[PDB]
Structures are given as structure tokens and as C-alpha cells.
């Protein structure tokens, strides 16, 4: 039977630590309005009194107002929401002293959940950025309209990164087959200043165009073997699991 | 008679295991409303009191709310649901002590049935993956545009597989007749990294096509006899049964 902890400024405002296995005692004096604040995003279902005529009930959303309107009111409340169900043990105060104006709940369960999943993205982001155990190949030739040349090009065995100077206009890249036929390849843009364009394929050829200017890129050490994407993520450290179930 | 055991924090919150061979004892006092929680997703049909007037029953979803309105509230509750029916012995307590603020069920039946189904599915999956009594043929041959050829090819006597280097595009595979015509064949992609393509016929000849480039795969040890598929599924250790009867 948790008694809510008094606010340091005034005992008339009380905080209590929520628990699905305990019932909180509510002290109500004659003629005051008892304020219940629900945590954000609780969808109210319904409640129940020990005496519907003993206490006055008004609710809109996450705010519940309780007020005794009949003498000698010793009943209880069971309020249910989509997430949880709060339980109270109401004792009518006989001396109009030790009044409690408002009750607020602390939810250690939500904190425990969110802190855990916060650590979840912590691990995910760390694994993504760490990218250790990856090799880089730099052997790349070039020919054509040199003015739109990428300042550097390299591949990580999965992608291929092209970079350009801050004054260089970002060109387009087209994936070249063995026969000389150009076809699209999905490009993603990364890098500090959007000076890195990454294409989602490794190919023994590439071609770069802009306006009526062209350029070819050769992979002098195209490794057809590569490393299988054993996890379906750009990293070898991010497992990809099927959430949907069913 | 099952009597629920209270929670360690409050004697009002009691937990109990459902059983169809006995009826829950509920010890209600005057001035309390009892919260009853059905199993998640359970579908209530109807209920029955000894006295419809003795207790009020308000229900929304899976939540049951009761409270005695008359003295000597000594009757029964028989609520029926789609999956089961719950039974209660509402006994009035004249001392207004030892309340029942709630009652939550720990179902053995649903998890007990779940474990069996999970066990059956596990046995099924183990039967598929174990894959014993399999002979393998590797005498495969190619000719043509080698640039998109598979790294490996083999048959288990039933299916023909092709493994492709993780950097290479996945090509389209066609069936070849003894005459020289081409026919679509169903393909399923298996393997850890989706680098193994499986076609559903063991055949002397195969053509692989992509873009403008083609490659013909030749089997040098096509065995017409094969293995009979008498169990109706890819495994020799799984049957297929006609459950529909009729």
C-alpha cells in the first residue's frame, strides 16, 4: 500500500512510484478536488468505483479528477487503460487535514524499456560506424573529359565510393556492362559535405557523364569473389531479423 | 475450490492459475469493485449469476467488473468465452476486511498447447534441414559467355542448384529441351546469403541468360531414373497428409 511521497514544497502534492502489484492509498478530505495526472499517451478505457455516488468523477484524456461528495466514503477505484490498470484504496479523511491535492506516477517500467532500446540504437550505430575488418582497394584508372574527374575513388568490396572537390559539380554515374551498355545503379550520398557519392555495386567498369561530357572508370583489380552479405546489412555486424512474424 | 494467493506487496492483489476442473473462490467485501482480466484476445460470449441483481457486471473487451448491491451476496458466476469458460464463487464477506481488488489468471492450457505446436514445427524443420540419404552430382559443364557463369553447380538428384559469386548479378535460368526450344522453369533462391539459385528439374541441358549474353550449361551425367518423390515433399523424411478428409 504505497503512500505517495510528499512534494518538498508542499505535502499536498504527492508523487508515488507505480507498481502493477501494489495498490496506492488515496487520502481525501472533505471538499477538495483530487487531481490525477496520467502519463502521456495513455488511452483511457473505463473505471469502477466502490460507490458511484460517493465520489465525483470527471475525465478528459490523461487527466482524472476525483472528489468525494458523500459522507463516509471508503471505497476503491480500478481504472484501466490500453497499457496498464491503476488501483487505489480510498480512505475518507475525517479531520480535513493532510489533504492531497494531486498524485503523479513514476513509471520504472517505461524507463527500463526505453533505456534498454536506447542502448539498442547505441549498439547499432556503434556497429555501423566502427566498420573494422573491412578492406579497401584503390587501383582505379580513368579516361575521358578530365574536368569532371572525381578526386578519389575506392571500393570496400561491397560498395564503391567516388568523391569530388567542394567546387566540383556532382555528376551522374552509370553502371556499364561487359558489352558497353549503360544501365542505372542506385546511388546514395554520404560524407561530411556531400562530397561522397556511393554506388551500390562493384563493377569492372563505370562511366560518369555530365552535359555533353563523359568519362570512364576502370577497376584494375575487379574481384568477382567478394564477401557474401551474410547479414543483409552494409556492415558485417548488424544482424537483420524478421520482426513481422505471422 | 481454488483460492488465489495474494501478491507479496498487497494482500488485495491475488494471482491464481485457471483450471477447468475446479472453480475459483472469490471473497468479496462490500464497497470494493473487483477487476477480472481475461486472456489476451479471448472472446467473451455470455455470463450467468445466481442473482443478476446481486452483482453488477460491466464488461468491455476482456475486463470484468463486479460489486455486490445486496446483502448475503452468495451466488455463482459462470462466464463463457470462445476458448473456455471461467467459473467463480462470489462469497459475501460481512467483516469488510481482506478485499479482492483484482484477479489475474496464469493460464497453463494456452502455453501448454503452444509448446506442443512449437515442438511439432521444430521436428518438421529439423526433418527438412537434416537432409540425409542425399547423393550429389557435380559433373557439370559450360560453354558460352563465361562472364556471368555460376561459381558452382550441382544436383541432389531432384533439384539443380547454381551458386553465384556475391558480386555478380543474379541471372535468369531457362529449361532446354532435346530439340532446342526454351521453357520457363520455377526457381527458388536458397542459401544463407541468397547466392544459391535452385531450379526444380534435373535435366541434361540448361541455358542461362542475361542482357545480351548467354551461357549454356551441360549435364554430363543426366540420370533418367532419379529418385521417386513418393512422400509428396522435398524431404524423404516428411510426408504430406490429406487433412481435409471427405
Amino acid at each position: 500500500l504505497d503512500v505517495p511521497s510528499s512534494s518538498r514544497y508542499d505535502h499536498r502534492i504527492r508523487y508515488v512510484t507505480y507498481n502493477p502489484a501494489d495498490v496506492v492509498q488515496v487520502d481525501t478530505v472533505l471538499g477538495v478536488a483530487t487531481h490525477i495526472m496520467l502519463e502521456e499517451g495513455e488511452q483511457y478505457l473505463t473505471h469502477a468505483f466502490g460507490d458511484s455516488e460517493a465520489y465525483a468523477f470527471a475525465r478528459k484524456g490523461r487527466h482524472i479528477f476525483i472528489k468525494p461528495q458523500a459522507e463516509l466514503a471508503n471505497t476503491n477505484l480500478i481504472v484501466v487503460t490500453d497499457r496498464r490498470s491503476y488501483k487505489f484504496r480510498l480512505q475518507m479523511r475525517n479531520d480535513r487535514n493532510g489533504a492531497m491535492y494531486e498524485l503523479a506516477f513514476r513509471y520504472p517500467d517505461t524507463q527500463a524499456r526505453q533505456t534498454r532500446e536506447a542502448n539498442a540504437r547505441a549498439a547499432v550505430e556503434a556497429a555501423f560506424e566502427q566498420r573494422v575488418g573491412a578492406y579497401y582497394n584503390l587501383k582505379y584508372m580513368m579516361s575521358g573529359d578530365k574536368d569532371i574527374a572525381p578526386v578519389n575513388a575506392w571500393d570496400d568490396g561491397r560498395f564503391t565510393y567516388f568523391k569530388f572537390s567542394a567546387n566540383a559539380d556532382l555528376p551522374s554515374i552509370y553502371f556499364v556492362d561487359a558489352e558497353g551498355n549503360e544501365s542505372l545503379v542506385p546511388r546514395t550520398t554520404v560524407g561530411s559535405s556531400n562530397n561522397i557519392i556511393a554506388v551500390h555495386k562493384v563493377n569492372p567498369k563505370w562511366m560518369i557523364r555530365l552535359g555533353n561530357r563523359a568519362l570512364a572508370i576502370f577497376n584494375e583489380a575487379y574481384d568477382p569473389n567478394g564477401v557474401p552479405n551474410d547479414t543483409g546489412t552494409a556492415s558485417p555486424a548488424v544482424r537483420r531479423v524478421n520482426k513481422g512474424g505471422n | 475450490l481454488d483460492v488465489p494467493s495474494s501478491s507479496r506487496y498487497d494482500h488485495r492483489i491475488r494471482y491464481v492459475t485457471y483450471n477447468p476442473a475446479d472453480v475459483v473462490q472469490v471473497d468479496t467485501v462490500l464497497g470494493v469493485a473487483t477487476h477480472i482480466m481475461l486472456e489476451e484476445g479471448e472472446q467473451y460470449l455470455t455470463h450467468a449469476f445466481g442473482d443478476s441483481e446481486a452483482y453488477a457486471f460491466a464488461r468491455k473487451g476482456r475486463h470484468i467488473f463486479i460489486k455486490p448491491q445486496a446483502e448475503l451476496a452468495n451466488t455463482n458466476l459462470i462466464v463463457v468465452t470462445d476458448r473456455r469458460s471461467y467459473k467463480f464463487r462470489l462469497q459475501m464477506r460481512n467483516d469488510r476486511n481482506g478485499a479482492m481488488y483484482e484477479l489475474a489468471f496464469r493460464y497453463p492450457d494456452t502455453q501448454a498447447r503452444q509448446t506442443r505446436e512449437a515442438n511439432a514445427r521444430a521436428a518438421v524443420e529439423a526433418a527438412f534441414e537434416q537432409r540425409v540419404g542425399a547423393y550429389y552430382n557435380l559433373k557439370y559443364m559450360m560453354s558460352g559467355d563465361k562472364d556471368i557463369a555460376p561459381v558452382n553447380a550441382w544436383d541432389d538428384g531432384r533439384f539443380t542448384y547454381f551458386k553465384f559469386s556475391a558480386n555478380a548479378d543474379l541471372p535468369s535460368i531457362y529449361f532446354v529441351d532435346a530439340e532446342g526450344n526454351e521453357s520457363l522453369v520455377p526457381r527458388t533462391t536458397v542459401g544463407s546469403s541468397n547466392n544459391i539459385i535452385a531450379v526444380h528439374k534435373v535435366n541434361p541441358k540448361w541455358m542461362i541468360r542475361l542482357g545480351n549474353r548467354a551461357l549454356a550449361i551441360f549435364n554430363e551425367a543426366y540420370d533418367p531414373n532419379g529418385v521417386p518423390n513418393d512422400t509428396g515433399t522435398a524431404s524423404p523424411a516428411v510426408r504430406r497428409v490429406n487433412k481435409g478428409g471427405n
Binding site: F49, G50, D51, S52, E53, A54, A70, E71, L72, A73, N74, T75 | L30, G31, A56, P68, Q69, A70, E71
Partner: peptide, 15 residues
């Protein structure tokens, strides 16, 4: 009609 009885009957008839 002692007030405790008032409380009891109001409790009973209430929903």
C-alpha cells in the same frame, strides 16, 4: 437511521 447505515445503503444501491 444511523449515518453508518446511510453509508451502507448508499453503497449498496450505487452502481
Amino acid at each position: 437511521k444511523t449515518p453508518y447505515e446511510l453509508a451502507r445503503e448508499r453503497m449498496l444501491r450505487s452502481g
